[PDB]
Symmetry: none
Subunit: 143 residues, 2 copies
């Protein structure tokens, strides 16, 4: 199945995610930082696999530039989430054929280099399209 990024929007036969502007969660308690990608995913088929968590798992790689390497970023988990419940409460739940839900995906930052959102077809993780974000210009929310 084929996949693209159109401006600010991921596009596939099965779904479209609108990438809201990402930002840092500064987890002040354990001096760790995450990058958070809010998104408005709208399901285009009826398919139990179409939950946001397994979308991101299935089709998205985040990486972050660094002095000698290009760093793959791990999935982030937050101690609690009263804060973002509005955007996470459906990260596990399937999306109805016509409908749109809010999702948010967290990755564990390491460094301060620019970020790349990559997109890859289901099986193969060769990057098919990408979007980059200047780190310097991302807004940063504490915890």
């Amino acid at each position: 199945m084929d996949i693209k990024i159109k401006g600010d929007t991921i596009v596939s036969d099965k779904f479209e995610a609108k990438i809201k502007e990402p930002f840092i969660i500064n987890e002040k308690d354990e001096k760790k930082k995450y990058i958070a990608f809010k998104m408005e995913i709208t399901a285009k088929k009826d398919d139990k696999d179409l939950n946001p968590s397994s979308i991101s798992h299935d089709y998205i790689n985040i990486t972050q530039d660094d002095k000698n390497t290009v760093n793959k970023l791990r999935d982030g988990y937050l101690l609690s989430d009263k804060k973002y419940k509005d955007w996470t409460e459906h990260n596990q739940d399937q999306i109805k054929k016509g409908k749109t839900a809010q999702a948010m995906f967290i990755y564990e930052l390491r460094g301060d280099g620019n970020i790349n959102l990559n997109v890859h077809k289901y099986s193969e993780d060769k990057t098919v399209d990408s979007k980059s974000f200047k780190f310097s210009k991302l807004k940063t929310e504490d915890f």
Copy 2:
């Protein structure tokens, strides 16, 4: 298809060069198992997502160890934690930029106390193309808990 060599203490290919730091044993004291550790300074020579250290070792390196009747293929090791070697393992999965060099470390599960051979083989075919040997007797050995 791509060609490969060992020059002294260094691996050489069109895509990269690894410097083989002197290897050594991790004695995992908790589960009475030993590993051989190859620290390395890999420097990428192309731009290529496949060029991460893990998949290099996988793609191009066989370790073996001599034994009384056989010559033993050594498995890939995994350590319980790795605060200890984070310096050398944190990038084992990540790609290396066209001109840059990163520290990698590859662990193999020892079986026996025979001498070690590092073999090198082209991408597809695993016929050894070049090799280096290390006398086991003289390797330094670092514990763990």
